Amino acid sequence: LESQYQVGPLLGSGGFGSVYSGIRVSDNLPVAIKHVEKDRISDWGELPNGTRVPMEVVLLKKVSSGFSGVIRLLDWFERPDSFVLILERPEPVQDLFDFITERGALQEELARSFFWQVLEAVRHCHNCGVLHRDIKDENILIDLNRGELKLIDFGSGALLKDTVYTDFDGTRVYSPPEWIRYHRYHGRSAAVWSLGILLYDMVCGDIPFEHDEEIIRGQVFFRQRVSSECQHLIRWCLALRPSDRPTFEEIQNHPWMQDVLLPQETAEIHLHS
Numbered sequence: 001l002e003s004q005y006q007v008g009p010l011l012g013s014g015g016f017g018s019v020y021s022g023i024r025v026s027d028n029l030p031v032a033i034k035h036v037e038k039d040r041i042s043d044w045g046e047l048p049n050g051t052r053v054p055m056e057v058v059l060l061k062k063v064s065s066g067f068s069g070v071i072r073l074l075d076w077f078e079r080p081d082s083f084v085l086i087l088e089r090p091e092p093v094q095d096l097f098d099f100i101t102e103r104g105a106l107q108e109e110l111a112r113s114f115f116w117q118v119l120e121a122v123r124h125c126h127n128c129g130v131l132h133r134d135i136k137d138e139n140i141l142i143d144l145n146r147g148e149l150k151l152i153d154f155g156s157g158a159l160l161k162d163t164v165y166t167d168f169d170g171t172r173v174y175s176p177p178e179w180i181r182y183h184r185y186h187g188r189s190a191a192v193w194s195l196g197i198l199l200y201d202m203v204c205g206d207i208p209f210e211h212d213e214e215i216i217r218g219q220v221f222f223r224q225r226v227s228s229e230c231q232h233l234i235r236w237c238l239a240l241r242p243s244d245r246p247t248f249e250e251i252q253n254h255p256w257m258q259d260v261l262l263p264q265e266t267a268e269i270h271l272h273s
Protein backbone atom coordinates (compact mmCIF):
# COMPACT_ATOMS: atom_id res chain seq x y z
CA LEU A 1 0.00 0.00 0.00
CA GLU A 2 2.72 2.42 0.98
CA SER A 3 4.59 1.61 -2.24
CA GLN A 4 1.50 1.88 -4.46
CA TYR A 5 0.26 5.23 -3.17
CA GLN A 6 1.82 8.50 -2.09
CA VAL A 7 -0.21 9.96 0.76
CA GLY A 8 -1.00 13.67 0.77
CA PRO A 9 -2.81 15.95 3.26
CA LEU A 10 -5.76 14.96 5.43
CA LEU A 11 -8.95 15.95 3.63
CA GLY A 12 -11.23 15.39 6.61
CA SER A 13 -12.04 13.15 9.55
CA GLY A 14 -14.89 12.34 11.93
CA GLY A 15 -17.35 9.58 12.73
CA PHE A 16 -16.57 8.06 9.32
CA GLY A 17 -12.82 7.70 9.99
CA SER A 18 -9.94 9.61 8.36
CA VAL A 19 -9.72 10.50 4.69
CA TYR A 20 -6.49 11.57 2.98
CA SER A 21 -5.60 12.96 -0.42
CA GLY A 22 -3.34 10.64 -2.36
CA ILE A 23 -1.84 9.74 -5.70
CA ARG A 24 -1.55 6.31 -7.28
CA VAL A 25 2.12 5.80 -7.97
CA SER A 26 1.99 4.02 -11.35
CA ASP A 27 -0.43 6.47 -12.80
CA ASN A 28 -0.31 9.70 -10.92
CA LEU A 29 -4.07 9.07 -10.65
CA PRO A 30 -5.56 11.24 -7.90
CA VAL A 31 -7.13 9.10 -5.16
CA ALA A 32 -8.62 9.41 -1.68
CA ILE A 33 -7.36 7.12 1.04
CA LYS A 34 -9.90 6.30 3.73
CA HIS A 35 -8.95 4.66 7.02
CA VAL A 36 -11.51 3.09 9.32
CA GLU A 37 -10.65 1.50 12.67
CA LYS A 38 -11.88 -2.09 13.00
CA ASP A 39 -13.30 -1.42 16.46
CA ARG A 40 -15.49 1.30 14.95
CA ILE A 41 -17.10 -0.94 12.35
CA SER A 42 -20.46 -2.36 13.43
CA ASP A 43 -21.74 -3.49 10.03
CA TRP A 44 -19.74 -6.37 8.60
CA GLY A 45 -20.21 -8.13 5.28
CA GLU A 46 -18.89 -11.03 3.24
CA LEU A 47 -17.04 -10.99 -0.06
CA PRO A 48 -18.09 -13.34 -2.90
CA ASN A 49 -15.00 -15.37 -1.96
CA GLY A 50 -16.06 -15.43 1.69
CA THR A 51 -13.83 -12.78 3.30
CA ARG A 52 -14.80 -10.77 6.39
CA VAL A 53 -14.97 -7.15 5.32
CA PRO A 54 -16.78 -3.93 6.28
CA MET A 55 -20.25 -3.77 4.71
CA GLU A 56 -19.05 -0.45 3.24
CA VAL A 57 -16.69 -2.41 0.95
CA VAL A 58 -19.56 -4.68 -0.12
CA LEU A 59 -21.80 -1.69 -0.87
CA LEU A 60 -19.04 0.15 -2.72
CA LYS A 61 -18.24 -2.85 -4.93
CA LYS A 62 -21.95 -3.27 -5.79
CA VAL A 63 -22.10 0.30 -6.84
CA SER A 64 -18.76 0.83 -8.48
CA SER A 65 -19.28 0.40 -12.22
CA GLY A 66 -19.46 2.70 -15.17
CA PHE A 67 -21.87 5.21 -13.70
CA SER A 68 -19.91 8.16 -12.36
CA GLY A 69 -22.62 9.46 -10.02
CA VAL A 70 -20.92 7.55 -7.19
CA ILE A 71 -17.24 7.79 -6.16
CA ARG A 72 -15.84 4.39 -7.07
CA LEU A 73 -13.78 2.05 -4.89
CA LEU A 74 -10.50 1.29 -6.67
CA ASP A 75 -8.88 -0.99 -4.10
CA TRP A 76 -8.85 -1.85 -0.42
CA PHE A 77 -6.42 -3.22 2.14
CA GLU A 78 -6.72 -4.85 5.56
CA ARG A 79 -4.33 -3.86 8.35
CA PRO A 80 -4.10 -5.26 11.90
CA ASP A 81 -6.46 -2.69 13.41
CA SER A 82 -8.07 -1.06 10.36
CA PHE A 83 -9.22 -1.18 6.77
CA VAL A 84 -7.91 1.18 4.09
CA LEU A 85 -10.09 2.09 1.10
CA ILE A 86 -8.65 3.60 -2.06
CA LEU A 87 -11.29 5.79 -3.74
CA GLU A 88 -11.35 7.88 -6.89
CA ARG A 89 -10.74 11.59 -6.32
CA PRO A 90 -11.93 14.26 -8.78
CA GLU A 91 -9.69 17.32 -9.11
CA PRO A 92 -10.56 20.11 -8.73
CA VAL A 93 -13.38 19.20 -6.34
CA GLN A 94 -15.43 20.76 -3.54
CA ASP A 95 -18.10 19.16 -1.39
CA LEU A 96 -21.60 20.57 -1.60
CA PHE A 97 -21.57 21.65 2.04
CA ASP A 98 -18.55 23.88 1.47
CA PHE A 99 -19.98 25.07 -1.83
CA ILE A 100 -23.24 26.24 -0.28
CA THR A 101 -21.35 27.76 2.65
CA GLU A 102 -19.29 29.85 0.24
CA ARG A 103 -22.02 30.71 -2.24
CA GLY A 104 -25.07 30.85 0.02
CA ALA A 105 -28.46 29.74 -1.28
CA LEU A 106 -28.15 28.35 -4.84
CA GLN A 107 -30.03 29.77 -7.84
CA GLU A 108 -32.79 27.36 -8.76
CA GLU A 109 -31.35 26.51 -12.19
CA LEU A 110 -28.19 25.30 -10.41
CA ALA A 111 -30.09 23.57 -7.61
CA ARG A 112 -32.17 21.77 -10.26
CA SER A 113 -29.08 20.46 -12.02
CA PHE A 114 -27.46 19.39 -8.75
CA PHE A 115 -30.62 17.79 -7.33
CA TRP A 116 -31.30 15.89 -10.57
CA GLN A 117 -27.80 14.46 -10.52
CA VAL A 118 -28.16 13.41 -6.89
CA LEU A 119 -31.43 11.66 -7.79
CA GLU A 120 -29.77 9.80 -10.65
CA ALA A 121 -26.97 8.72 -8.32
CA VAL A 122 -29.38 7.56 -5.61
CA ARG A 123 -31.42 5.67 -8.21
CA HIS A 124 -28.22 3.99 -9.33
CA CYS A 125 -27.44 2.87 -5.76
CA HIS A 126 -30.95 1.48 -5.32
CA ASN A 127 -30.75 -0.29 -8.68
CA CYS A 128 -27.52 -1.91 -7.47
CA GLY A 129 -29.25 -3.06 -4.27
CA VAL A 130 -27.63 -0.44 -2.04
CA LEU A 131 -29.25 2.04 0.35
CA HIS A 132 -27.00 5.02 1.18
CA ARG A 133 -28.71 6.23 4.44
CA ASP A 134 -26.72 9.47 4.78
CA ILE A 135 -27.61 11.60 1.78
CA LYS A 136 -26.58 15.17 2.58
CA ASP A 137 -24.46 18.07 1.35
CA GLU A 138 -21.31 16.87 3.11
CA ASN A 139 -21.55 13.54 1.28
CA ILE A 140 -21.75 15.00 -2.19
CA LEU A 141 -18.67 16.04 -4.20
CA ILE A 142 -18.78 18.50 -7.09
CA ASP A 143 -16.35 17.87 -9.95
CA LEU A 144 -15.89 21.56 -10.65
CA ASN A 145 -14.57 21.19 -14.21
CA ARG A 146 -17.23 18.77 -15.45
CA GLY A 147 -20.16 19.98 -13.35
CA GLU A 148 -20.69 16.38 -12.20
CA LEU A 149 -21.83 15.41 -8.69
CA LYS A 150 -20.63 12.25 -6.91
CA LEU A 151 -21.93 10.45 -3.79
CA ILE A 152 -19.46 9.57 -1.05
CA ASP A 153 -19.48 7.76 2.28
CA PHE A 154 -21.26 4.42 2.24
CA GLY A 155 -20.15 3.85 5.84
CA SER A 156 -23.71 4.25 7.12
CA GLY A 157 -25.33 2.35 4.28
CA ALA A 158 -27.10 -0.99 3.97
CA LEU A 159 -28.29 -3.58 1.51
CA LEU A 160 -31.57 -2.32 0.13
CA LYS A 161 -34.57 -4.36 1.31
CA ASP A 162 -38.34 -3.93 1.24
CA THR A 163 -38.96 -4.53 4.94
CA VAL A 164 -38.44 -2.14 7.86
CA TYR A 165 -35.10 -0.89 9.14
CA THR A 166 -34.76 -0.57 12.92
CA ASP A 167 -31.21 0.77 13.03
CA PHE A 168 -29.84 4.11 11.80
CA ASP A 169 -26.44 5.76 11.97
CA GLY A 170 -26.78 8.53 9.41
CA THR A 171 -27.30 12.22 10.13
CA ARG A 172 -30.13 12.89 12.55
CA VAL A 173 -31.26 16.24 11.12
CA TYR A 174 -31.75 14.46 7.77
CA SER A 175 -33.61 11.52 9.32
CA PRO A 176 -37.38 11.12 8.87
CA PRO A 177 -40.10 11.64 11.51
CA GLU A 178 -40.89 7.91 11.56
CA TRP A 179 -37.30 7.25 12.67
CA ILE A 180 -37.43 9.98 15.30
CA ARG A 181 -40.78 8.79 16.68
CA TYR A 182 -40.81 5.03 16.16
CA HIS A 183 -37.20 4.02 15.42
CA ARG A 184 -38.34 2.47 12.16
CA TYR A 185 -38.37 3.45 8.48
CA HIS A 186 -38.43 1.93 5.01
CA GLY A 187 -35.46 2.58 2.75
CA ARG A 188 -36.85 4.47 -0.22
CA SER A 189 -39.30 6.73 1.59
CA ALA A 190 -36.61 7.62 4.15
CA ALA A 191 -34.26 8.46 1.28
CA VAL A 192 -36.90 10.76 -0.26
CA TRP A 193 -37.27 12.58 3.08
CA SER A 194 -33.51 13.20 3.23
CA LEU A 195 -33.66 14.40 -0.38
CA GLY A 196 -36.30 16.95 0.64
CA ILE A 197 -33.97 18.21 3.37
CA LEU A 198 -31.11 18.36 0.87
CA LEU A 199 -33.18 20.31 -1.65
CA TYR A 200 -34.32 22.78 0.99
CA ASP A 201 -30.71 23.26 2.04
CA MET A 202 -29.68 23.94 -1.56
CA VAL A 203 -32.22 26.67 -2.24
CA CYS A 204 -32.28 28.15 1.29
CA GLY A 205 -28.65 27.82 2.34
CA ASP A 206 -29.53 26.00 5.56
CA ILE A 207 -31.51 22.95 6.70
CA PRO A 208 -35.19 23.36 7.60
CA PHE A 209 -35.23 21.51 10.94
CA GLU A 210 -32.83 21.56 13.87
CA HIS A 211 -34.63 19.74 16.71
CA ASP A 212 -36.54 16.44 16.89
CA GLU A 213 -39.78 18.29 17.64
CA GLU A 214 -39.42 20.32 14.43
CA ILE A 215 -38.87 17.15 12.37
CA ILE A 216 -41.92 15.48 13.92
CA ARG A 217 -44.12 18.53 13.32
CA GLY A 218 -42.89 18.71 9.72
CA GLN A 219 -44.00 22.29 9.10
CA VAL A 220 -41.72 23.85 6.50
CA PHE A 221 -40.95 27.58 6.62
CA PHE A 222 -39.00 29.15 3.77
CA ARG A 223 -36.43 31.67 4.92
CA GLN A 224 -35.42 32.63 1.39
CA ARG A 225 -37.32 33.34 -1.82
CA VAL A 226 -38.11 29.98 -3.41
CA SER A 227 -40.42 29.36 -6.39
CA SER A 228 -43.85 27.86 -5.84
CA GLU A 229 -42.99 24.73 -7.83
CA CYS A 230 -39.80 24.15 -5.85
CA GLN A 231 -41.62 24.76 -2.54
CA HIS A 232 -44.28 22.26 -3.60
CA LEU A 233 -41.71 19.57 -4.42
CA ILE A 234 -39.88 20.13 -1.12
CA ARG A 235 -43.09 19.93 0.88
CA TRP A 236 -44.05 16.76 -0.98
CA CYS A 237 -40.72 15.07 -0.19
CA LEU A 238 -41.16 16.14 3.43
CA ALA A 239 -44.64 14.65 3.83
CA LEU A 240 -45.07 13.35 7.40
CA ARG A 241 -46.60 10.06 6.25
CA PRO A 242 -44.01 8.09 4.26
CA SER A 243 -46.67 6.83 1.83
CA ASP A 244 -47.56 10.47 1.08
CA ARG A 245 -44.03 11.15 -0.24
CA PRO A 246 -43.32 11.03 -3.97
CA THR A 247 -41.59 8.11 -5.68
CA PHE A 248 -38.38 8.89 -7.54
CA GLU A 249 -40.37 8.79 -10.78
CA GLU A 250 -42.77 11.41 -9.38
CA ILE A 251 -39.95 13.68 -8.22
CA GLN A 252 -38.26 13.55 -11.63
CA ASN A 253 -41.58 14.16 -13.41
CA HIS A 254 -42.33 17.16 -11.17
CA PRO A 255 -42.74 20.50 -13.00
CA TRP A 256 -39.85 22.02 -11.03
CA MET A 257 -37.56 19.29 -12.41
CA GLN A 258 -38.13 19.89 -16.15
CA ASP A 259 -35.47 21.12 -18.62
CA VAL A 260 -32.48 20.27 -16.42
CA LEU A 261 -29.08 21.49 -17.61
CA LEU A 262 -26.45 18.98 -18.68
CA PRO A 263 -23.49 18.67 -16.27
CA GLN A 264 -21.09 20.45 -18.65
CA GLU A 265 -23.61 23.26 -19.25
CA THR A 266 -24.00 23.55 -15.48
CA ALA A 267 -20.25 23.93 -15.11
CA GLU A 268 -19.87 26.50 -17.89
CA ILE A 269 -22.71 28.67 -16.58
CA HIS A 270 -22.31 28.32 -12.80
CA LEU A 271 -18.93 26.82 -11.92
CA HIS A 272 -16.33 28.19 -14.32
CA SER A 273 -15.07 31.40 -12.71
Ligand SMILES: Cc1cncc(-c2cc3c(cn2)cnn3-c2cccc([C@H]3CNCCC3(F)F)n2)n1
Binds near residue numbers: 089
Ligand atom coordinates in the same frame (compact mmCIF):
# COMPACT_ATOMS: atom_id res chain seq x y z
C1 LIG B 1 -16.73 12.04 4.79
C2 LIG B 1 -16.27 10.90 3.90
C3 LIG B 1 -16.46 9.59 4.29
N1 LIG B 1 -16.07 8.60 3.51
C4 LIG B 1 -15.49 8.84 2.35
C5 LIG B 1 -15.30 10.17 1.96
C6 LIG B 1 -14.66 10.46 0.69
C7 LIG B 1 -14.21 11.75 0.43
C8 LIG B 1 -13.58 11.98 -0.79
C9 LIG B 1 -13.45 10.91 -1.68
C10 LIG B 1 -13.93 9.64 -1.33
N2 LIG B 1 -14.53 9.47 -0.18
C11 LIG B 1 -12.77 11.43 -2.86
N3 LIG B 1 -12.56 12.70 -2.66
N4 LIG B 1 -13.01 13.07 -1.39
C12 LIG B 1 -12.98 14.39 -0.91
C13 LIG B 1 -12.19 15.32 -1.58
C14 LIG B 1 -12.19 16.63 -1.13
C15 LIG B 1 -13.00 16.97 -0.05
C16 LIG B 1 -13.77 16.00 0.55
C17 LIG B 1 -14.66 16.38 1.70
C18 LIG B 1 -15.89 15.45 1.77
N5 LIG B 1 -16.77 15.86 2.87
C19 LIG B 1 -16.08 15.73 4.16
C20 LIG B 1 -14.85 16.64 4.18
C21 LIG B 1 -13.90 16.30 3.02
F1 LIG B 1 -13.40 15.01 3.16
F2 LIG B 1 -12.86 17.24 2.98
N6 LIG B 1 -13.75 14.75 0.10
N7 LIG B 1 -15.68 11.17 2.75
